[PDB]
Amino acid sequence: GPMELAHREYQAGDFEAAERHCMQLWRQEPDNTGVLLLLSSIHFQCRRLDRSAHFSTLAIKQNPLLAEAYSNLGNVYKERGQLQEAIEHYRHALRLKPDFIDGYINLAAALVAAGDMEGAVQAYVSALQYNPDLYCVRSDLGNLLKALGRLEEAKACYLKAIETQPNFAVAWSNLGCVFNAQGEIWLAIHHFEKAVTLDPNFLDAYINLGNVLKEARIFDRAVAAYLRALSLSPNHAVVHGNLACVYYEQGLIDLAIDTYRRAIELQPHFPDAYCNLANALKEKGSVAEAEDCYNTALRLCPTHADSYRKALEVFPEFAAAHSNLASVLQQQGKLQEALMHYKEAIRISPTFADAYSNMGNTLKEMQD
Amino acid sequence: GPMELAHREYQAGDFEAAERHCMQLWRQEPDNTGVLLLLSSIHFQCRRLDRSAHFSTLAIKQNPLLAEAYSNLGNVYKERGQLQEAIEHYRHALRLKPDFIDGYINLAAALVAAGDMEGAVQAYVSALQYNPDLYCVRSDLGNLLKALGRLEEAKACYLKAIETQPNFAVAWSNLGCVFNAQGEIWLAIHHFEKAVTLDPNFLDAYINLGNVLKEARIFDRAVAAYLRALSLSPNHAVVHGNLACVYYEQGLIDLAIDTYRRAIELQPHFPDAYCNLANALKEKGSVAEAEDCYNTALRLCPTHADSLNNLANIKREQGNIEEAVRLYRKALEVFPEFAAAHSNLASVLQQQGKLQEALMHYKEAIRISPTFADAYSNMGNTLKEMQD
């Protein structure tokens, strides 16, 4: 019947001819469930949820064993942010039909949105069980795993996804991030480079690639990548602050001062960006306009806590503070404890002169 | 009901002891296949090719179905250099005993050592069907596979041998060389890194690591390597001649100068090293000496294209164009795929107004390295001068 025309207009995005043909039909065969189904679906592609859940309900009132109809209702519920009800409907529709892949996917979605990470992954495994070719779902699953700390399991979904669809940059980039978190630098670089080689316009691939080469200390390469990132997104505030950093390490204290600032303009929040500029100013030869920058950053927030025990409680292994705190504790009869603090400070920062110099005195004030 | 107190001591590495017990064991029981075989293994171990193969002959006269008997006998033939003799003994020993692993292995060596490579490949394969956990035997397969081009296969092997033995250092490095040869700079280095994290004295590991960091132009690191590699092998010439280039690359022209001279010491016949020392001199101004090294380099290797092409440059800069062209032409004869030489000449021609004959070489040097920016600029100019 017009089911042909309907399915046509609907395929052609021409949602109005669709809805027309449908009502026509429905008014002749009030039982055509696939129609009340199509309708529901249509009013959904038109943000018209109420009319969507309405026809979904008509479908059920004509046949309570339609897995799809409870899915559709589940979809109208998820958007209205009504997660419990979305889930409740997805689970039923899956009871009526255990091989309904779309339901498993919708449900995973609502589940994660609702907090249940474990359920979500159980749904993806089911989904993948029935259709191991959905490489995107593999990936999404891999993400949830990574999100939960199961990197090796994540590493597997990604590899499997790549295996299922060799040409799929997202995968490699995600797989590259797993390796990075694992300290497997050369591997991260390899995947990122591969991600990028696959989709040149892959912004984040370029940012991540630059970040690893940065950490690896391979600056020229680290740069070439950051630049290529900025060309794809001239406004990325963080990239600047990082690119600048590679410039300051490379030995261009000037361009750092230049680029560090511009970064701030992009987002006057970057605290690290200010203090980094302060240290860059000290080298340039301007201690005065360096300290203000230090304050500026410092003033913006107590986040870093540089502004002792509390700063220590915040910053683990902050040699500087371990030295400061130790001095006071030492010039207070509590040398024995300061000694342990300096010791720790010197264990943190091998080249902390004042620390060996302070401890030598503390250990000498213990003999007296 | 035999007297086996003889094999106990034998196993300890106490040949004579065994030999003594044995001798008497046969004296009473002149059919000690086990004694004769043990005897032959001993002698062979201690380089007694003649005695070794003698007891073995006996153990065969007695029990002819002794695989290990023919294998030991063949081992001696191989050692002597007689591969045909040794190959049939290994084959027979296998007909008799199919599950005879040392039989397959020993076969592989001799086969490779002879010529058949796919044959020695089979031996390795079967020997692995009987005991898949013999990893050191997996590598050797890959190595053999690699040298045969099939890298994807050899890769499978190294990949597996590591699965079997994760701490199998040589495994890594070797797999590393497959990625490098495949242009997988990042993997190739990643592996070469395990190869050394695991075994910190793995020379070839370092020499391989830096050799690749270098062609990726990651010179600081590539120096940490060769430095290491050289700490393990103080007089390794080739490693000097490569460290030198990494220096020259980072500006330190004087170090490279010394270094290249060191590497030449540890290897008089070292063209490439000369032809590079020259390059170094040529840039420090010492263009006289520079011309001398390229002279030597072309003395040692009358066909050294880079020495050819680079000496022509020095000649073009002395007005010596005709000659500069003879050299540019000799270097293109020794290597028709020489992008550089192709434009270098295409420049001397363009400077003489021989534009058409200059396009010819600029086209041919671009088709040989589509990334040649310089040859693109020049050919751009010539085409213009032909249109004004």
Ligand SMILES: [Ca+2]
């Ligand atoms: Ca003209």
